[PDB]
Design a protein around this ligand. Structure first.
Ligand code: B12
Ligand code: X6I
Ligand code: 5AD
Lengths: 520, 259, 84, 520
């Protein structure tokens, strides 16, 4: 029988897992029969189309807009791109340039037999798949050469808004004990319907997620890894109206982690749920093939709801996300399900409750590289008590073996970190992780104590919520505001105009390649 | 000691362990490599700041070209606590029933409030605390007020949408949520909103309230807003200020008075 | 945000997130009761200490007549690193 | 039942306890055959003699010096005082005043029958003993009225040097949350061979231990405790050349806690070993009768030695101190044996070793109000990491259930605490004690793990050290520098001239009254 410290009810965990599986079946029934414009633009990007036109709009945008307005986008961009390839005989990028300049019209060319179009596109599809596979191989080779950590991976964020100062401070933090570098994205990029072009020296609240920024930061981190002798990871966010596009860009530029969750988009950016689900399927397929670790965002639920009353919502969401990822083909080793140390610091025995919850999460998902994130809601202007709270956060991280550790900052409630705040956070985390290096294997828990009872209570509540959500359906459950206590209409939000219905002859070469190449 | 002094409220200076020692703590980074020259530069900077006889208790290099310092020192400057003119944010709040009675007695009609987190900002926790009828730490929001019709427009609201909705619903006061000053886009967004209202000509017919985790009344008045609210504000303060200002300056409002 | 963003060794000033922002931190106790007047007194003391737009992030009572402050703000002063 | 979290070897603990008992018996053989001038001065003070002469010399000093120079102090100051009382009919204070003025000569008075002298002296000894018992009853009544705490007691220090500023700071700290206030003593008073008279307004590094200062501090703390609704304890230091006198003064003034340890003086102050032992016996008898909690200073060993190598030394010292206290009549509930959290923060698994040692100490002494003390050796100017280290120290305190808790300060290595530093320390301690309140009842330890093996190792090393000390003798072992790596010779140090040998007709009523009082 599975080993546990909380004497968990494993039959209840199995029932909760089955309920989440059936929820995902019901939701995937719809996702299979639809696609969005971002998926088509991602297909265009994968086929080799890139660059910008005179007005500054990317060429994938131009091609997809042309196909949508003049023709039938339910056939997919691959059909028309391949047909133009047969007709003119050029490469997809040249066709996109011709369309942008106005010298060609894809929807007026006679349509060839679909079999020939598939044969025309297959070669470029295979080339792109092989490029992504070679990137995965290179990442594995780096990790094998330098060796991999056994304890938590320190995780810092750089957000100055200038790509080059981001490079400088990312190298500075990597030279310190940082293991994963995340470049928080510019505010109001999730709302855009296009991915900018080129490197950006400007940004409010963060940096724009562009392919050239990815390349620059990857080069910088590779150099620093050669210097330090250990591998420094690169992280970005695949949220927004262009989720699969950023997923593909990261897969091509060899990012090692990626924040891929649709519920965050729906609940905190007000994007339509159908759009986000259909984007999320393809982006997770790409991330699973590329070897990227997908990080979910259940930490954000607690900043809106109550952490003690609505703790089971995080577990239910984690099980649903696990099942989504499994359907997309992602293995457990790439499922960085996230939770946070987010109770009231004035709650008696709050540490025992957080410890019980973290251990329960560590026990239900034994293989996952679970992510633990700092306290944010109850952080005040006292930098010293904030340092103490972060110390307790690290204590819980080391006592219950969390794989990824998002370092909290001395001055969360004030501003984005300075250099010195990050240095102090890294130093404290290293101290606590060295002193209690082997406390997880020593401390056990009283049978029938506060910790075991808390864990079983949260598990039972999560199972009941999962049964409820299964009865209604995921979209209805979101409508009634059960996650984060945010009610979202089914047909509201941004981007519902980008959703389209698949034709009976819809063609997307990459799904089969990325789902069967990884399996055989 | 021979020349130690007692407290004087006209010359108050910090208090480490004696009444008038004036000991201070401060930390900062310098873009120079560690060493004795870095320590001397930090000491000279501290002396120029005002801290006579500083003593660097810590210094370590963050990078090859950055050092982080901690300094304790005795201050020279003194402030006069008796003549301080404070800021204009002093306000006390009446109860909900008192607010309803005041609105009924003086204005004779309901007060309409439109609130939003305009711009690209996404946070809505503070504005939901102020507006949402659930309340915040026992203080019920504006929506609950019987004689107040409060609308919650959410976040990421463009300024144009905000002004258009305010005109459509006949708003008497508008509320704007922002964040700490280290966010520098809040100033530009607030100025743009004020310019939009001035262009529309509705500025004189409505009140303007801007708040956030580190917004202050002085900045709000500098921008041109009618008030500014920071941490610790509750719905009763806002309701009291709106009703009192509306009666004092006799805001006509946009209720049934579309542009 | 600052006009100057390139390091000059004749005018080195504190560093926050950008080169010349000059952000500083400082904490002290004042023998005056906690309140709005105490916050204004702390701000005025910091301003005469050489900090632009000081921003009190914390203020708490230690006793009935003592208040503890934490302040952040940019620094006007610059020091010549070459001439030392 | 002897229930243990560390699976201790109770037979080994019993053998170590027996070895300590035998060592203390051997040492006591010598103590019972000698008395010091300080003991005679304490007897004179307990009879009623107090004040100063024209030259500022305390009156007890003048009286004892007179009997020593002119008469034979081997009989005891009580014999001469009683003889003078019978001969002249004056009270002890008037007799001492006459002796100081030279109008009377104790040695010129013919010696009367010892029976009458004993009766006359006991007439006043009974009154003094009754007053001390009254103070004990008063302390118990305050504790019952206000109710007693269940968690650790916060312990702070005030060191202004002026009694009134000390009162102000102590009241402020008690209002902030301190449960015990200790007024650190003026530097270089332990070497002094008299106790000043009256209040002191200036001192270097602390405040003098005088009866008037005790009275003023007690008044201030009583007022503040009435204001706050809970009891504020008062602590002061007895060790020195005038140890028994300060012990008696604290007993008269209702001090709740008192640091009473001979080995500290012997090692870190170079006081002769015989003098300190003889002083300690009587001082501990007085403290035990008065109901004062006596603390021991094993923390000081680690600052001059290595914590990992020399923990058995601390445990053996604690067992010896326990046996000394038991022979002095102090019950287990008044034996505040001390230990410190002083391991290297750079040591991997250091927290596990600290936890194992703390739990072993908590287990071997199940009833003592143990004292846990902060890290001081490995502090620096990084106040933030200092705060983190203090937080870990508090974590250990709460997880092992240490009764008294000496708060550490983030500015330990820089200066004496500011008011704000004390406020921050108290706030952190409160937070950690509230959050992890019932963690002691929950967390167990893995059988055979690191913690259990560390505890057993330290126990066996302490047993071997105790066997060595039993074979050699306490004085020789002190000469060999086994306890703090400091070698003090047997016949060296300050105060050897004050030691005396008891005459066969030596008389001291207070010993009998205070030893037989507790037995009803
Ligand atoms: C919750 C939170 C979020 C949530 C919000 C969820 C939601 N739907 O509302 C989410 C996940 C969206 C989030 C995201 C981000 N956030 Co945020 N977040 C926080 C957090 C933890 C709490 C802020 C909060 O609302 N506090 C609770 C409320 C009740 O307090 P309040 O704001 O003070 O409100 C009171 C008063 O100020 C006043 N009041 C407030 N508004 C108004 C308005 C009026 C008119 C009046 C009269 C009064 C008033 O009354 C209220 C009740 O007493 C803080 C950290 C912290 N501990 O402060 C960071 C923080 C505010 N966020 C920050 C940032 C940078 C972001 C991002 C923009 C970064 C990015 N990715 O680009 C993102 C993206 C969001 C975006 N697009 O704008 C920074 C801002 C610092 C700065 N730069 O100056 C902070 C400080 C964290 C940090 N240091 O890194 N965040
Ligand atoms: C799941 C997921 N996916 C994508 C994004 C990117 O966001 P976006 O680019 O689409 O706008 C996020 C962002 N989370 C920001 C929280 S940080 C606030 C915190 N309380 C603090 O104290 O700092 C995310 O969680
Ligand atoms: C923005 C990135 O950092 C995380 N993020 C930043 N700080 C916090 C916090 N204290 N609590 C929760 N999430 C946070 C997000 O989950 C994402 O990974």
């Amino acid at each position: 029988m599975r080993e546990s410290k909380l004497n968990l009810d494993w039959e209840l965990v199995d029932k909760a897992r089955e309920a989440a599986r059936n929820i995902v079946k019901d939701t995937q029934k719809f996702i299979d029969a639809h696609t969005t414009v971002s998926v088509e633009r991602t297909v265009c990007r994968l086929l080799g189309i890139d660059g910008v036109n005179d007005l500054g709009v990317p060429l994938p945008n131009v091609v997809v807009d042309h196909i949508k307005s003049k023709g039938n986008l339910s056939l997919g961009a691959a059909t028309y791109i391949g047909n133009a390839m047969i007709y003119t005989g050029l490469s997809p990028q040249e066709i996109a340039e011709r369309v942008a300049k106005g010298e060609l019209d894809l929807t007026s060319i006679p349509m060839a037999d679909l079999f020939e179009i598939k044969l025309a596109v297959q070669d470029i599809a295979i080339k792109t798949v092989e490029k992504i596979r070679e990137n995965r191989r290179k990442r594995e080779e780096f990790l094998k050469k330098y060796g991999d950590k056994e304890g938590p991976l320190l995780y810092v964020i750089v957000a100055t808004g200038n790509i080059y100062e981001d490079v400088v401070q990312a190298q500075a933090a990597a030279r310190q004990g940082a293991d994963v570098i995340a470049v928080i994205r510019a505010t109001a990029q999730s709302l855009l319907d296009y991915v900018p072009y080129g490197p950006t020296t400007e940004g409010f609240g963060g940096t724009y997620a562009t392919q050239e920024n990815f390349r620059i930061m990857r080069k910088a981190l590779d150099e620093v890894s050669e210097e330090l002798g250990r591998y420094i990871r690169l992280c970005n966010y695949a949220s927004g109206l262009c989720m699969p596009e950023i997923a593909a860009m990261g897969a091509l530029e060899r990012l090692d982690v990626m924040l891929n969750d649709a519920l965050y988009g729906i609940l905190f950016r007000d994007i339509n749920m159908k759009r986000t689900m259909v984007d999320q399927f393809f982006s997770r397929v790409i991330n699973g093939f590329a070897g990227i670790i997908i990080n979910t965002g259940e930490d954000n639920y607690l900043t809106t709801a109550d952490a003690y009353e609505k703790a089971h919502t995080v577990l239910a969401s984690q099980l649903i996300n696990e099942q989504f990822a499994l359907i997309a083909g992602i293995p457990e080793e790439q499922m960085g399900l996230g939770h946070a140390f987010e109770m009231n610091p004035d709650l008696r025995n709050g540490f025992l409750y957080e410890l019980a919850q973290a251990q329960m999460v560590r026990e239900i998902f034994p293989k996952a590289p679970l992510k633990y994130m700092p306290p944010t809601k109850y952080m005040t202007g006292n930098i010293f008590k904030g340092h103490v709270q972060d110390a307790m956060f690290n204590v819980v991280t080391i006592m219950t073996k969390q794989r990824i550790h998002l370092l909290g900052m001395l001055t969360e409630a004030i501003h984005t970190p300075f250099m010195s705040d990050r240095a102090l956070s890294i130093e404290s985390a290293k101290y606590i992780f060295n002193n209690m290096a082997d406390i997880a294997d020593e401390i056990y828990f009283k049978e029938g104590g506060i910790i075991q009872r808390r864990a079983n209570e949260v598990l039972k509540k999560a199972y009941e919520l999962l049964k409820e959500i299964e009865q209604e359906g995921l979209f209805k459950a979101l409508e009634q505001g059960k996650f984060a206590d945010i009610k979202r209409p089914i047909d509201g939000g941004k981007g519902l105009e980008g959703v389209v219905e698949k034709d009976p002859n819809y063609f997307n070469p990459f799904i089969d390649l990325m789902l069967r190449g990884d399996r055989g | 000691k021979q020349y130690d002094t007692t407290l004087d409220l006209t010359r108050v200076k910090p208090y480490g362990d004696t009444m008038n020692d004036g000991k201070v703590q401060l930390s900062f980074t310098l873009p120079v490599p560690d060493g004795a020259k870095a320590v001397e530069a930090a000491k000279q900077l501290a002396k120029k700041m005002g801290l006579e006889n500083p003593m660097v208790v810590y210094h370590a290099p963050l990078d090859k070209n950055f050092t982080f310092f901690i300094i304790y020192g005795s201050l020279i400057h003194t402030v006069d606590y008796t003549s301080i003119q404070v800021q204009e944010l002093e306000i006390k709040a009446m109860s909900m029933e008192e607010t309803n009675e005041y609105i009924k007695k003086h204005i004779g009609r309901k007060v309409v409030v439109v609130g939003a987190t305009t711009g690209t900002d996404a946070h809505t926790v503070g504005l939901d605390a102020i507006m949402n009828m659930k309340g915040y730490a026992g203080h019920y929001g504006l929506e609950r007020y019987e004689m107040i019709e409060a609308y919650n427009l959410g976040s990421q609201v463009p300024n144009e949408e905000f002004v258009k909705k305010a005109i459509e619903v006949g708003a008497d006061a508008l509320l704007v949520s922002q964040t700490v000053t280290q966010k520098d886009a809040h100033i530009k967004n607030l100025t743009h909103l004020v310019e939009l209202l001035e262009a529309e000509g509705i500025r004189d017919k409505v009140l303007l309230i801007c708040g956030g985790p580190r917004i202050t009344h002085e900045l709000a008045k500098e921008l041109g807003y009618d008030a500014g609210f920071g941490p610790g504000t509750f719905a009763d303060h806002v309701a009291t200020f709106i009703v009192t200002e509306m009666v004092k300056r006799k805001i006509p409002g946009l209720k049934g008075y579309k542009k």
